Amino acid sequence: RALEALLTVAGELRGPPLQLDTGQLLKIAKRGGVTAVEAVHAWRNALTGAPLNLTPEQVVAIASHDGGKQALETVQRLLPVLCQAHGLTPQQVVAIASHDGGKQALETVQRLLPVLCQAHGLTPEQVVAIASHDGGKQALETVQALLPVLCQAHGLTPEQVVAIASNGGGKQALETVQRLLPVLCQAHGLTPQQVVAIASNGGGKQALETVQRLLPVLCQAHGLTPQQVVAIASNGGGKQALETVQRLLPVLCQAHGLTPQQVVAIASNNGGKQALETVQRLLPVLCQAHGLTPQQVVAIASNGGGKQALETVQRLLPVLCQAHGLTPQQVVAIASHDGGKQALETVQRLLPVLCQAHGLTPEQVVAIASNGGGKQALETVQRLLPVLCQAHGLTPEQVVAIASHDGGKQALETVQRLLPVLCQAHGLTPQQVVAIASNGGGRPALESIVAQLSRPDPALAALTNDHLVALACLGGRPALDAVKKLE
DNA sequence: GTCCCTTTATCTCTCT
DNA sequence: AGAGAGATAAAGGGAC
């Protein structure tokens, strides 16, 4: 019964004004549901046209959530009242709106941002942070409710209260800190800093509780220190991570060899449980079928989704090496980040049309993949490389440089965006723009430079454009912001 | 379906 | 280049 309505709406939504594609409408259907896709079909015009002007990807972002219809409805209602009335940018709104029950988060933002700023001294960016989640309305109401007692009875700072509330089930973590802080500190000598670190993670309640019940056991019985424990607790799925460490402590330090430290290191990211289990399974495989060492595997595993990385190393190692002519060290390198599954996969399916259909080396490609988000890097190269070499006069080595960093996608995009405005309007050369973009944070660096030239902050008008450039190159937005307070 | 929560995976910026 | 920390995205389960 679901397929009928999806096929009915689908290649009518694939046309104007949305131009959506398979994967896109797939994402909507399997999270916002058929209602979401129908609502997108219906209000397709009101969403892209003024005064909303929503980009397609932004629409997709609002719909693909339990409630997407309501989220669209409410965005169309209060997209200008929030901007108009609370100086919010439309992107901030779109960010509040793109979670389960965005309609509540939006309505509650409208209703509470004033008091939360005036009565409790939040900045709009803090309020938007609290609301930008699943059960945002709840987090907001619980900040408004609890912030005075947490600050006054428990000695936390407003910032800490915001950190706790800025995740999944923020309310649960706030109330759990309210309940458990004077026990975690009293009877275990933790600090408010530590209790906040534990709670400032999705499922934070379960993390705090699990710490109260398993710290004495992991520590005073499995030979761990409170520091190692809190370390494990201070990521998402910290309860699962803690319990899994407690089970597998003696089932990995005497079997596979792994040491306590290695265990806690693999347990100290998102899905630490998964990564630990996958390590228990795959460590003897990859070391005696792929030739790898313990150290390498533990590296691949000591990341977020480390499980996915382990399993994709298993799956893709020989084929990438023996066909695509990569080496083990290289592959371990590409995998040793957050998203190495996506990295390895994207290398596998793209190394062809970059080496062949362009002229990239596998080493260049490997360097593009060896940086967190590598997938996005590579894909954005594959799109924007003809654009950037035919219509802007860049050499491939330059594009490869720009993508050879975290935020590569962002870097390259922001290059094509502001490639003539700074070169034509302000007199920068291409090599300058590339030079700026070729670091971590190229996108915000380029953005602050354009934001400088097109309206000189006098403290920085005191420098020649070139100095500005070399400055943006050596430290980006942070350094360009730092060399203004010094005056 | 719509809202809230928890767990898990991915991406981007800053800091040296 | 690594680590830390934020942010965004995906998947699933309880509740009504």
Residue numbers in the entry: 236 to 722
Quoted passage from the original study:
Transcription activator-like (TAL) effectors specifically bind to double stranded (ds) DNA through a central domain of tandem repeats. We then present fifteen crystal structures of engineered dHax3 variants in complex with target DNA molecules, which elucidate the structural basis for the recognition of bases adenine (A) and guanine (G) by reported or uncharacterized TALE codes.
To test this speculation, we generated dHax3 variants with the 34th residue on repeat 7 substituted with different amino acids. In total, we obtained nine high-quality structures that elucidate the accommodation of base A by Leu, Met, Cys, Pro, Trp, His, Thr, Asn, and Glu at the 34th position. Interestingly, the side group of Asn34 donates an H-bond to N7 atom of A, reminiscent of what was seen for the coordination of base G in the DNA-bound PthXo1 structure. Asn34 form the hydrogen bond in a different way with both A and G. The length of the hydrogen bonds are about 3 Å. Given that O6 atom in base G is more electronegative than N7 atom in base A, the H-bond with O6 atom may represent a stronger interaction. On the other hand, Asn34 was originally thought to be a strong code for both G and A. Recent study indicated that Asn34 favors G over A when a large number of these bases exist within a given sequence. Asn34 is a strong code for base A only when the discrimination between A and G is not a concern with the target DNA sequences. Nevertheless, the discriminative binding of A and G by Asn34 or His34 unveiled by the structures provide unprecedented clarity to understand the biochemical observations.
